[PDB]
Amino acid sequence: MVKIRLARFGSKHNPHYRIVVTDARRKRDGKYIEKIGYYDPRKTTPDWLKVDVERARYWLSVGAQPTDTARRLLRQAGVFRQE
Amino acid sequence: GRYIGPVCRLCRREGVKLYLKGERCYSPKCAMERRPYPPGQHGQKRARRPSDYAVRLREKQKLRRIYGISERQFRNLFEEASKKKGVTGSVFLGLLESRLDNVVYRLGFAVSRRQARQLVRHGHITVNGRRVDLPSYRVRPGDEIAVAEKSRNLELIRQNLEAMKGRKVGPWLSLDVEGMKGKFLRLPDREDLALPVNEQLVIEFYSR
Amino acid sequence: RNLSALKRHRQSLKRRLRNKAKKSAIKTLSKKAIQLAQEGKAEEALKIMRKAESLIDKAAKGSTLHKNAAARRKSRLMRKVRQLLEAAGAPLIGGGLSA
Amino acid sequence: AKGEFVRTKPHVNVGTIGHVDHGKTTLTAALTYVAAAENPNVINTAHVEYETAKRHYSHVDCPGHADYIKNMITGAAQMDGAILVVSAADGPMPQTREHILLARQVGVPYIVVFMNKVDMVDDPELLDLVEMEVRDLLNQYEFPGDEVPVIRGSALLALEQMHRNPKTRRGENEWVDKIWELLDAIDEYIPTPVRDVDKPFLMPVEDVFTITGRGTVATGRIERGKVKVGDEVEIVGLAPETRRTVVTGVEMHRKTLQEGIAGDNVGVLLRGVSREEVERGQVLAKPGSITPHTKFEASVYVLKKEEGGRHTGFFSGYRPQFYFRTTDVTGVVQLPPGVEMVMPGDNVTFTVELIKPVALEEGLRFAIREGGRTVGAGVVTKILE
RNA sequence: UGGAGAGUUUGAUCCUGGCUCAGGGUGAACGCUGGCGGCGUGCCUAAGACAUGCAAGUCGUGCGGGCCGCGGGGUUUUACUCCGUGGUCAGCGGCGGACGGGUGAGUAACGCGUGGGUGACCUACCCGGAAGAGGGGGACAACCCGGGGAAACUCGGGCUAAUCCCCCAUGUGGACCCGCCCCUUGGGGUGUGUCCAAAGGGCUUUGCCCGCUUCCGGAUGGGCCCGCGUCCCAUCAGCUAGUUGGUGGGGUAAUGGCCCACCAAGGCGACGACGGGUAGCCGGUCUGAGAGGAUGGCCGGCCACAGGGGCACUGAGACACGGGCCCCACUCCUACGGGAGGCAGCAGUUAGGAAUCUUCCGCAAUGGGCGCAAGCCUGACGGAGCGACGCCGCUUGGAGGAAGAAGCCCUUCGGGGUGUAAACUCCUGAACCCGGGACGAAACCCCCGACGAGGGGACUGACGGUACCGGGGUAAUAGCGCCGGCCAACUCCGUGCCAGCAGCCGCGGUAAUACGGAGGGCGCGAGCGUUACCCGGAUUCACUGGGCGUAAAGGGCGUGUAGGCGGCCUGGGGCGUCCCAUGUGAAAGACCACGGCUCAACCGUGGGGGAGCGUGGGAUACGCUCAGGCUAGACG
RNA sequence: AGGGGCGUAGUUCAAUUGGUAGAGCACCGGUCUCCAAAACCGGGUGUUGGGAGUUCGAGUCUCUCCGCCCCUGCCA
C-alpha cells in the first residue's frame, strides 16, 4: 500500500534522505508520489529535518502507512501531536 | 604538481622580470639584471616577429607563471570567470587573487609564492579560526587569514613578519603585524594589481 | 536443491481441481436449462435455471469466478432462457426469472 | 562436494624412475590402491599420492625416454628421493642407467630400488645377481649402492589382488606385502629435508591449468615461504614484463589447502590471468622478490668426457640450453679476453645472454645441456642486465 | 551575453571547390611513464557456454502430529505418558514468491513521447463509513501399517485438526432477467421474482488486540482505446480473406474480427501502402552563437525478454527470472526404466575480443516480505577491494647561493649555453611513529499516561581503531609529446631518393631547423601521446544560411493530372494566427543564489525558465472559408 | 610436455656423385650526370637458422637448441 518513507540521496558517506509518500513496491530511490520533506541524519546544518505539516497529515488520513524510522521523524516534526 | 624548477629561467624567457624568489628576484641579479634574454643556446639572437598566436600564448604563460599555477587549474578559473557575471578580465584576476597560498604571500608571511605555498601546505596558516592547508583554497571577503599558534615562533614567520614593519598592503587587505592576522576586505581590481600582464589579450588565447 | 515453492504447486493442483469442477458444473447445468427452455418445459426450465444461477454466484464466493464474470454468465442465461420461453409458453413456476 | 585438506604428518616428494616398460607406471598404480585401505580417503608425468601412517606423499610417474628427458628432468628436481625400478627379467638396461646418472645430476638424495617383476623365471642367481649389478651401477655413479633398501616383489600381481576387493590389510598376500615392505621401508632411510618458511615466496611453474569456472591454476612445488588466499604475487620470467596478481585458491592433490608451506606441489588459482599468459619456466613469488634478467656471469664447471661432458672444448660464442628450475632456455656465451680454448674440466666464469628473460638471481644454481648431454653446471655470479 | 580561422590547384591573380589542421567530447582501447587521496565509474563483443556458494521467505497469536531437554508422576512403580513450557523436523492452512535484482535479443509498433477518453474495466495489503459474524455436516496431509524403486520420489488401506471444504438461515446490502422514472454508449434510482455472506485466534476476558463476511467511498497501482510525434532504400509500387464492414454468438475485469458461424464487398497506398535493412523509446548526454547535428553508457520512467519455442494452472495480479507442463539443442547422473539443470541475480570461469573488476564485509543505516511482537529472511542496499578509466585536490620541497665549478653542447677559440640549476647553508616536514578516536542511532520495544498525544528509559556500527585531532618526524617520483609551415620551440654530427618521416603541403639524390642521435628549446605534468568514433570549424544539404550563361547544376519542347501559389471592394464565420487565464510539462540533470565535507570534485536546500499539448475566455490585420459586389489578370 | 615438417645470398632457386658454396630477377662501384634511368667496364654480394659431434674435410650424416606450421597431451 501507499507509504511514507525515506529515499536516499546525497552521496557515499553523506546520507541525505528525502521524506516521501511513494508506493510500497517502488524501488527505494524510484519515482515517488510526492516529496513532503527531507532529513539530514548528520545534522550538518541547522535544518536537518523539515516536513510538510498540512501534507504529511493528508496522506496519513488516507492510508499512507509511515515507515518505522520514518514516523519517528514525522513525530519529531509534530505531525501527530494534537494538543 | 606545481612547476618546481629553474625559475629565473622563466623570469627570463617571458621578457618581464618576474618575482619567483622574493628576496633574490629583487636584488642585483634577478638574472633579468645580467641576461635579460631568453635561456637556451640561442636566446640572444634576432627575435623574429611574434605570430599573433605566440603573443597570446606568451601573455597567458606570463600570467599563469606569476601565480605558479598548473594549466588545468588555471584554465578552470578562466572558464569559471566567463560563466560568472561581469567582465571576465577582472573577475578572472579576482579569483586568481583570492587563492589562499597567494593571499598569504600578499600579506607578508611569505617572501615568494613558492614559499607561501609550502606554508599553507605544511599547516602554518589559518582561516577564520580553523587551519586550511589547500593552496587552492579560495578566500572570500570578511575572512581573516592568520599564522597558526605553533607557527608564531618559527624562525621564518619572524623575518617575514618583521620586514612588514611599515610596508603597507593592498587597499583590499588589512594586517595585524603583531597578531599575525589580515582580512580580505574587498576583491582586488585590474588597477590595484599593477601586473605586467594584458588580461583582455589572454582572454583571446582561450578562443581559437 | 529445492524450495517451499512446491507448497504452492501442490496447493495449485488442488484448488485448480476445486473450481475446475465447480466450473464445469455451471456449464453442464447452464445447457441443461436452455436445452429445455426452448422445448417448452417452462416449469422445470426455471427450476434448473434457478439452480444454475445459484452455482454461479456460488463460485463467485471464492477465487473461481469472482464478480462480473459471474454477473455476466447470469445475464446471458436469464436472457437466452427467457428469450426461448416467450417462443410460445408462459413462465410457469416463478423460478428465478423476474415476472 | 569438494572437501578440505588438514595438516599433521610431514609431506614428502617422491617419484619412480628406471628403464621404460619395467614397472614404474604400474607399481605407482599399486602403491596408491594399497595405502587406501587402512587410510580412509585416497607420455606425461602423473602427479598422484598415497598416505602411509607416518607421512604424506606426492609421487611422480614420469614417462621416461631418450625423447621425454625434458619433461622428466623437471620432475626430478622437485623430489626428495626416487624409487629406482628394476625388472628381474632384464636387469640394468640402458634407460635404467640414463635415469640414475640423470637423477644424480639434478641433485636428489638417496634411492629406494624396488625389484619389480620378481614373479617371473625363478632363478637362484638372477634375483640375487640383480641386487649386485645395481649396487655396482649405483656406486659406479657414486651412490650409496652398498646400502640402499632393495625390496623385491611383483607389483602387477599386487594390484590385481586389489581390484578383487578394495580393503586389504597388512600382509594378507605373500604379495600385498613386499609393496608394504617398500612402502613401509620407504618412509624409512629417506629423511625429510629442511623446508624454510622464513624466506620470501617463490614457486616455479611446472604445469598450468585452466579450471572451468575458476581460472588459470599454476602448479609447482613452493621453494620458500608460504601463500594463502588473498596473497599478492608476481609472475616473473618469460614475458613482455612481470605481471602481478593475487592468489585466490591453494590446494593439495585436488583438495582445498589452507596455507601450503615450502616443499609441496600445490596448485594455485591466480586472480584474473588468461591461460596463454602463464607458462612453465616462470615463477610465482613475493612482490619485489627477484626480477627478470637476460645477461649474467656464473662460476661454471665443465664436466670431462669421463663424466658425460664434451671432449673438445668450446670457444666464445657457444649456444647451449641453461636449466634454472622448471625451465630450459638457450643462451650465447661471451667472456674474458682469452680463456678462448676452454676445453673440458675448467672452472671459468663467463657471461650468458639468454634470448628469453628468466628470473635470475645471484646465488641461484643451474646446469648446461647441449647435444643430449649435461656439458656443464654452475651458479649465478653477478647480474649484468 | 553570443559567432576568430589556417594549409593545400597558379609563374603569378581572383573565383569555384574538395581535402587537411587548431576546439570540445568518450563505458574506451594501445604505447611510454606512474606517488597519495576523495567522488565517480568499469563485457560497448558471443542474448555464447558456465564448476561452486549463496541471491525468498516468513506466521505455532490459524491447526494436528513426530522428536529432544525438562515441571509433577496418571496408579501406589516405567500402565491408557494428561498436560507444563521453550525448543526443533516436516505437513496442513495463510500472506509474500507478479516486488526488489539482470539484460537489450526482439520490436518501426499506440512500443515509446505527449495530450486526452473509459456510459467499456480491474485494483491484494492500506485508510473512512454501513450491517453482520446463528446453526450445522465432511475431506485430505502429517502420523500407523503394507507395497514398487538406484534415485528423484510414488501407489494403497486406514485415523485426525483447523482461519481447509460444503449444506441451511439471517439479507444491512449486492448480483441477474423484465417494467418504470431520471440520465444519456453499459450510470443512477425503484418495484416484483430468483440467487449470494462469514473463521476463530491470543489475552490482563459481557473488554480489548489480530483476523472473517457483504456493501459503499477514498487512496494507490494498473487494462483497454484515441489525436499528434518517432530511422534508411522507391534499383520495393502496388498490398489485403479474418482481409474491411454487418448480425447473432463465444470470450474477457472490459471495448474489439480478440475468436466463430452467416451475410456484404470492402479496407490500405506516391500525404509512400506492401517489402527489405537497421534500431529498445524517453528524461537526458556531447557538440553547437543558434537553428541544428550526434547519441540513448551510469542515474530515473516506460516497454520487452529470462537456454530456443509453445501452453496453461494457482492467483487481487503472471500465461510467472531462482513455479508447472510439453518439444528442441546442449551439460551432467543412472542399477539404462527414467532422472537433473538453465548466472541477461551477486561473485567467480571459460570462449570471443583492442578491452571491462572480489568466488570481500554487514544487515549498523534506508527500503522490502511475513509476524501482535520479539524477530526472521533480504548478493535490494550500506560499505570495503581491484583498474590513472574519468573528474577534483595534494606531493616530489622552501629561502639563500658565482660577472657563474665540473660534465656535456656549441664556438668568428675571446667565449656562449645548460644555469640559481647543482654543490653548499639554513628552513619547513609527504610519509612513516606513539597516543586519543567519531558522525552516521533513534526509533521499533519497555515504563508513567488509555498499548492516543506528550514525557522517560534501554539496546543496536559492517565501514573501523577508518576519518579526523594531538605529539614526534626523514629532502623525500618525473615523465610524455613536440621544435620546416599550418603551430609554441634550433643548432651540431650521422646519413646521402638509402635508412627513414608524413594529419595536409611535402622532407631525404654528400652542408637535411623535415630522417637518426646529441645539446638546446617549447607545451603539458601523474601524466603525456596514439588509434577509433561524434559535433565543430563545413553558409561543404544553406530553415536560420548556398547555388545552376562559361566553375558541378535548366528538363529537347509542348499539353496538362495531383499538388503549390492567388487581383480589387464589402459582410458572416473565426479553422490558421495572436492574446489572457488555467491544467499538464515527475525526479534527477542543466542554470542561478546559499550552504556541507579544510577546497574542489562530489552533495543538500531554495529559486527561475520552458516550448509543446488539453480547457475556458477574447481579437480579426493577414491567410483560409461562405456570401454579395468589381474589371486593372485572363478568355470571348 | 612429447611426435613429425621447413629454414642456403636481397629474392625465388642449385651441388641427395659428402672434396669452398653456383645460377637468373636484383643489387654495388667505375665512366657519365645535379642524382638517377639507359649504355659501357668491372664485381657473388652468404650468420647454409644457432651451437656443438663424428670426419683428414659437412650445405649433405648425429645430436641439442631457436622461430614457424601441423597431430596429439593437459582441472590444484
Ligand SMILES: C/C=C\C=C\[C@@H]1O[C@](O)([C@H](CC)C(=O)NC/C=C/C=C(\C)[C@@H](OC)[C@@H](C)[C@@H]2O[C@H](/C=C/C=C/C=C(\C)C(=O)c3c(O)cc[nH]c3=O)[C@H](O)[C@@H]2O)[C@H](O)[C@H](O)C1(C)C
Ligand atoms: C641435468 C639437467 C637439469 C639440471 C637442472 C638443475 O640442476 C642444478 O642446477 C645442479 C646443481 C649442482 C646442476 O648444476 N646440475 C648439472 C650437473 C651436475 C653434475 C654433477 C652433480 C656431477 O658432479 C661432477 C656428478 C653426476 C658426478 O658425476 C659422475 C658421473 C660420471 C658419469 C660418466 C658417464 C658414464 C659412465 C656413462 O656410461 C654415460 C652416461 O652417464 C650418459 C651418456 N653416455 C654414457 O656413456 C659421478 O656419478 C659423480 O656423482 C640444481 O639442482 C637445480 O635446482 C636444477 C635441478 C633445476
Ligand SMILES: Nc1nc2c(ncn2[C@@H]2O[C@H](COP(=O)(O)OP(=O)(O)O)[C@@H](O)[C@H]2O)c(=O)[nH]1
Ligand atoms: N612380470 C611382471 N610384470 C609386471 C610386473 N608389474 C608390472 N608388470 C608389467 O610390465 C609391463 C609394464 O609395466 P609398467 O608399469 O608400464 O612399467 P613402466 O610403465 O615402464 O614404469 C606391463 O605389462 C605390466 O603389467 C611384475 O611385477 N612382474
Ligand SMILES: [Zn+2]
Ligand atoms: Zn628572478
